[PDB]
Amino acid sequence: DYQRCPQCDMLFSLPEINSHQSAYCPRCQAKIRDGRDWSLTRLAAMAFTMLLLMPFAWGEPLLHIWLLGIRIDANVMQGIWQMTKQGDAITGSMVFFCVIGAPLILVTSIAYLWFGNRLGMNLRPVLLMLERLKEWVMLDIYLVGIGVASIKVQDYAHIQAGVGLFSFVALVILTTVTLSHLNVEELWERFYPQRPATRRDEKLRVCLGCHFTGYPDQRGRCPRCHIPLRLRRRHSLQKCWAALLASIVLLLPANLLPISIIYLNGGRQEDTILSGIMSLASSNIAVAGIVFIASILVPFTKVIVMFTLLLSIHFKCQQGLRTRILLLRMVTWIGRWSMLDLFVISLTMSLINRDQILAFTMGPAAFYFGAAVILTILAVEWLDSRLLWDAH
Amino acid sequence: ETQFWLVTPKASLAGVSGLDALVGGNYIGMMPGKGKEQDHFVALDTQPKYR
Amino acid sequence: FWLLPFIALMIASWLIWDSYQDRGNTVTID
Amino acid sequence: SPFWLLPFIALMIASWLIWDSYQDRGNTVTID
Amino acid sequence: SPFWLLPFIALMIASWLIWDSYQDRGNTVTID
Amino acid sequence: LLPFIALMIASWLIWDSYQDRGNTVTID
Ligand SMILES: [Zn+2]
Ligand SMILES: [Zn+2]
Numbered sequence: 153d154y155q156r157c158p159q160c161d162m163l164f165s166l167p168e169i170n171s172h173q174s175a176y177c178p179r180c181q182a183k184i185r186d187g188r189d190w191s192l193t194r195l196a197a198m199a200f201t202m203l204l205l206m207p208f209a210w211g212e213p214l215l216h217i218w219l220l221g222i223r224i225d226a227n228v229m230q231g232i233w234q235m236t237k238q239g240d241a242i243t244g245s246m247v248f249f250c251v252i253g254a255p256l257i258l259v260t261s262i263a264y265l266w267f268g269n270r271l272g273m274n275l276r277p278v279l280l281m282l283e284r285l286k287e288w289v290m291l292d293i294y295l296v297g298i299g300v301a302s303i304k305v306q307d308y309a310h311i312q313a314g315v316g317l318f319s320f321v322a323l324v325i326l327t328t329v330t331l332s333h334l335n336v337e338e339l340w341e342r343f344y345p346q347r348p349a350t351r352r353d354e355k356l357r358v359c360l361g362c363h364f365t366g367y368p369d370q371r372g373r374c375p376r377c378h379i380p381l382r383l384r385r386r387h388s389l390q391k392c393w394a395a396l397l398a399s400i401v402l403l404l405p406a407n408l409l410p411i412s413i414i415y416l417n418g419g420r421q422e423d424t425i426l427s428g429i430m431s432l433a434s435s436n437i438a439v440a441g442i443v444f445i446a447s448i449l450v451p452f453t454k455v456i457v458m459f460t461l462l463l464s465i466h467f468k469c470q471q472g473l474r475t476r477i478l479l480l481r482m483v484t485w486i487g488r489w490s491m492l493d494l495f496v497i498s499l500t501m502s503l504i505n506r507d508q509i510l511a512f513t514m515g516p517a518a519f520y521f522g523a524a525v526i527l528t529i530l531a532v533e534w535l536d537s538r539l540l541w542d543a544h
Numbered sequence: 545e546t547q548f549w550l551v552t553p554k555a556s557l558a559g560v561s562g563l564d565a566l567v568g569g570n571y572i573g574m575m576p577g578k579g580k581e582q583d584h585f586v587a588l589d590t591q592p593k594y595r
Numbered sequence: 596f597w598l599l600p601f602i603a604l605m606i607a608s609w610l611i612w613d614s615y616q617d618r619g620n621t622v623t624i625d
Numbered sequence: 626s627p628f629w630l631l632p633f634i635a636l637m638i639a640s641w642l643i644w645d646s647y648q649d650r651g652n653t654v655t656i657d
Numbered sequence: 658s659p660f661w662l663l664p665f666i667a668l669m670i671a672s673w674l675i676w677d678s679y680q681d682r683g684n685t686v687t688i689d
Numbered sequence: 690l691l692p693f694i695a696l697m698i699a700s701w702l703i704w705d706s707y708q709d710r711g712n713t714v715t716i717d
Contacts, residue, residue, distance in 0.1 A: 197600040204607040208614070236642055245639040253635070277627035284631070319610070322603070379627065391660050398664035405671060418568040449694055523667075548688055585688045 153348035155365045157182060158358045160541045165351055180477060180541075184363070190333045192266070192342075198330045199262040202255060202323065209323045210252065212316025214298060217503050219309040219510070224503060227316065228252065228294075231502030240514060246522050247498055250491055254289040255327060261285070265339075275343065276378055280361050283336045287533075290491060291324045297495035303439055304496075305503060337363060344376050357381050388536050389465070395531035396458050399524045403451065406520035412497055415511035422515070425493075443492075450490045454528050457483050461535070470544050477537060487532055490525045494518060545577025549591040 156163045160180040169175055171188040213225035228251060235244035261282050268275045302311055340362050349356060349365065356365040359374045359381055368374070368381040407425055414421040423431070425448070432440035457479055464476065497514060504512040552570040553562035565571060575594050 194597075194600075197597065201600050201603040201607065205603060208607070208610050236646065239646070241639065241642045241646055245635070245642055248638070249635055253638070277630050280627060281631050322606075326599075326603070387658060387660075390658055394658075394660050394664055398667060401664055401671065402667060405674065444698075445691070445695075449691055452694060453691060583684075583686055585686065587688055 154351040155184065155363075156356055156358050157184065158360070158363050159537045161358075161538060163352075163354065163356065180537075185337060186335050187338055189335050189338065192269075192339075195262055195330065195334065196266050198326060199259040202326060202330075203259050205319055205323050205326070206255060209316055209319035212319065213314040214317055214320065214499075215302060215314050215503075216312045217305065217309050218312075219504070219506060222506070224505065225314065226499070226502040226505075228498075228502075231498040234502060234505075235498065235514060238514060240516075240519055243494070243514070243519050243522055246526070247494055250288060250290055251294050251495070254285065255291070255323075257281075258285060258289065258327075279336065279339060279343075280377070282334075282339075283361075286331055286334065287488060287529075289327060289331060290488065291327055293489065293492060294495050295321070295324055297492050298499055300439060300443070300492070301496050301499040301503070304436065305500065308504070340364075340376060346376060357383060360385070384538055384542075385534075385536050388534055388539065389462075392458070392531050392535045393462065395527050395534065396455070396462070399451075399527040399531060400455060402520045402524045402527065403455070406517050406524055409517035409520070410515040411517040411521070412501075413511075413513045413515050415508070415513070417509060424517070425521075443496075446489050447493045450486055451524065451528060454483050454487055454532060458528070458531060458535070461540070465539055465543055468543050473540070473544065476540060480532075480535070480537060480540075484532055487525075487529050490529075491522075494522060545579035546582065546585060547575040547577070547588055547592070548585050549573050549588045551591070 154163070154165045157177040157180065159182045160177065162177055162179040164178055166175060166185060169185060169187050174183070175185045176182065177184060210228055213227050215226070217224045217226075232244045232248055232252075235247065261278055264273075264278060265275060265282075267273070268278075305311065346364070346366065355367060357368065358365060359376065359379070361374065361379050362376045364374060364376045366375050372380050374381045410422045410424050412421075412423065412428060414423075429440060429444055429447070432443060461476060461480065464472075497518065501512040501514055504510050549572070550570065551562055551565045551573050553560065553566035562570070573591060
């Protein structure tokens, strides 16, 4: 009926929305509300069939490689286990969370919400986790990674498609078509019912958790979810500054130390990211270009964009306001793709595992690269555009 | 009194030397001694016996 | 609609049955 | 804090991996 | 603000790496 | 900006190539 924009503080009346209809802010044109879509039972069935399909998708080999007269089969679990046995437990854990853990947590959340419907247990942090978890479900990125790796090692040996590749493709398609219709405010309004306002109050705040507009109670908590309600974020500037500085500091050991070590006939290569991308540009520049633009262009772009945004917040510049928001949206959209390098090196070290002729191993630099990617993603997510809009 | 030499495989007679250097690339071998101090050395030729 | 959760359920049952079919005997050798 | 729910669980599984990296070592022996 | 402690530890980790680099880096000798 | 970073990388590659350009000699 009447709401307030969560990114520029625009209080506007909300007309009724149909299935194909969509609502946007009149000022900054940001997505605000939806509805209708699918039902909870369809999502539960999708979660159930994902639970059925996942173990036979991860367990079965992705592709067979015939190297030096020896047939080698590999999958995700073997690569993660070899990463852990090497010693880099943190890199293996973050790869596990990015690839394997997220669908499991999604299925668990849907099942627990269904059991809360059946029983009546509290579901307050579960909805917040469900809303924030759509960013980390990166299965199509892993599909692009295995395609890039298959192109990369096509010349070295003979590659044949595995049985589990079809199941993995089916799982990816199912996750994509399920996440494309998962609505959170519909769940919030179905489980917890509220009432609209008088269309003109000039005192309604926006909850950063559930996008709800309403007066705070005597405890200062949101009437829909048990978190405090404030005008802006608490320490967004300080947290953003600390995370950006941490990412900038951790960038240097990621780029200087070697990332991949290739023992070739008893001799190791020990080349860094720059040497690897130079060799890839020399050999297979067609894929080296997309690797370069999706591996080292995105992190530096995000770092400089965040630094310029912080300097504009300090400087109170009002010259490029119409473009800073679009740059922030593009950075938020593009920060997810930066995890391609870890997937590629994981698959290559899982595939090329000859005893002494060819030994592909991960060096002590991917940990810093993954830490920098996570820190810059959190720095981008932690910032608020309302500080920029109020900087005028 | 430190000695340095270059281990490199060669097709010697009555046996071949440097099999490990052939497998893993030619390298540099060193042998310490009891000198005073030095920062500039002259490489040897055939790796003299050290006992 | 509900056609896909049934087709995928049938595929999962088929591959489970195929996995259960192909198992051999374990023998110990000294 | 509800928001601590998401990372802590992940940390839990990380400790499990750390548990698997600690039970794979027996006795250390020095050879000359 | 505990988050302000997040980079500093990593910073001294790099310092340890610096010491490790000073452990890895040694003396440069010229051979003819 | 992506084009600025691409131009910087191209300039760095050109400088690296020109640092050891040398003289071209023809041998039969
Ligand atoms: Zn707006
Ligand atoms: Zn709320």
